[PDB]
């Protein structure tokens, strides 16, 4: 069940994240990825001495995710590298571009009708629907010298704390199930936020937790803690706060409600 038993405050190598080449790929100085999980770049230009590195890591709980930063600005050729690489089809974006007056992610995607060369990465979006809770774009993904990228774009997340109810977060995390679930052998979840580490964490421990029940059932084991002890093995820190935390619980719990 989803009860909550333990209180929040009872909750590996860094290297090519701390090497000078790197240090203006990443958003935050003191938010790196775990060596043994990160996103490991190929094919990039011979003329770079370092081309491997993005602020990403693998998350494995069958899904997979990657969770990464918000892009800079010149972390957007490689975040479109990560994406084609890993086979990658659904994206999930769980903050405004700005957010009180503070940038938490760069535009990496064309407007609706437009096409634009990230790099060696040609993007067309071909299609927006915009519901209360989010935006779902339709991208078409090429090497310039193609696939569907579906990018599920939240926008309700409150500027301060966590939502108050988690009945958007649950209908978009089902659509998400749903369109992963559709694509033949598609490749793990992106999902990102400002550092990659607050927002992501709760979306994608939410997501684990919801999957383990669509196998097991209403009543199987959950272990929250034990989940998030997981998660932060593979990228620091997942779970910031403990409003997040708070907000797990009760997304659960409402997920077991709606069976």
């Not at 749903?178 to 490749?187: F, L, P, T, V, Y």
């Not at 990659?196 to 929250?224: A, N, P, Q, S």
Request: with cysteine; charged share 25%; hydrophobic share 35%.
């Amino acid at each position: 069940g989803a009860h909550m038993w333990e209180e929040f405050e009872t909750l590996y190598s860094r290297k090519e994240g701390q090497r000078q080449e790197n240090k203006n790929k990443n958003r935050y100085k003191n938010i790196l990825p775990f060596d043994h999980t990160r996103v490991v770049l190929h094919d990039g230009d011979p003329n770079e001495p370092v081309s491997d590195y993005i602020n990403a890591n693998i998350i494995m709980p069958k899904k997979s995710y990657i969770a990464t930063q918000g892009c800079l600005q010149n972390t957007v050729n490689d975040f479109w590298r990560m994406v084609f690489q890993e086979n990658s089809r659904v994206i999930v974006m769980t903050t405004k571009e700005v957010e009180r007056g503070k940038s938490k992610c760069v535009k990496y995607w064309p407007d609706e009708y437009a096409l634009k060369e990230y790099g060696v990465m040609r993007v067309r979006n071909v299609k927006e629907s915009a519901a209360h809770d989010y935006t779902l774009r339709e991208l078409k993904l090429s090497k310039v010298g193609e696939r569907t990228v579906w990018q599920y774009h939240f926008r309700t997340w409150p500027d301060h704390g966590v939502p108050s109810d988690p009945g958007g977060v649950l209908d978009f995390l089902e659509e998400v199930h749903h369109k992963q679930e559709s694509i033949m052998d598609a490749g793990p979840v992106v999902v990102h936020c400002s550092a990659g580490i607050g927002r992501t964490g709760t979306f994608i421990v939410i997501d684990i937790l919801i999957d383990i029940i669509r196998e097991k059932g209403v009543d199987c084991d959950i272990d929250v803690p034990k989940t998030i002890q997981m998660v932060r093995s593979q990228r620091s820190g997942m779970v910031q706060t403990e409003a997040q935390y708070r907000f797990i619980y009760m997304a659960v719990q409402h997920y077991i409600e709606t069976l």
